[PDB]
Design a protein around this ligand. Sequence first.
Ligand SMILES: CC(C)(C)Nc1nc(N)c(C(=O)c2ccccc2)s1
Length: 243
Amino acid sequence: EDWDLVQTLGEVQLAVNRVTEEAVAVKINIKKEICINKMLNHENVVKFYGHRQYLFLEYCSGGELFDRIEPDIGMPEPDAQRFFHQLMAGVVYLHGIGITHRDIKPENLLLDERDNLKISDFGLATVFRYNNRERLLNKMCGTLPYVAPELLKRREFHAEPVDVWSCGIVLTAMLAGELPWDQPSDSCQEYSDWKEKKTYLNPWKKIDSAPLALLHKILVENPSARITIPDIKKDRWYNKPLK
Ligand SMILES: CC(C)(C)Nc1nc(N)c(C(=O)c2ccccc2)s1
């Protein structure tokens, strides 16, 4: 139980145990990260083993989701669906226990050996439900291309639709190989074009009609009109058999 630090991965290093040889990722604001990690137990979330500051995390030898995406092309729709089902599974879970990730993007979706997707890095994560009472979020967190528009123009907002939006931006990235806009603001041509339904432009043009119908439902500007996860679970492309 004296871990060898083999190499740096990102400030995270790879630690291997000499006695048993089980690999773990070691990560070298934080009190909350450990706090939140302590609550989590899901097969689509990076596992927290413990800490001493040093964080002992499940090491994913698959890499990250971005590696799986070919620029300007994306990936086979079947792999995208499988990844999205698992992305949804993880997010449903986090939300189920009052946690929002707040920074969902392919950099934070890690792949294990089986290629199972794992949600990583709860550094920006926060509680949005406690004792069955929702707390709206007023803070701005995340990464401009994946953030929901309401977070840019509203004092307070609901946590869940924000995570849903980012998941849609991720689905776009898996199916088109590119990100639709710099940020979701009217001052941005690409975003104005989408709100205008100019789907003959990129990235939307690279995307089959069925997944694109789902993105029409996810990338909805009004967070109250935006599709919810239970309803995504009933969407036609989501339940479409793919080889
Ligand atoms: C090196 C890689 C991404 C294929 N495997 C990883 N496993 C874990 N556990 C990683 C991280 O925890 C991490 C954290 C921040 C930045 C990069 C990787 S990265």
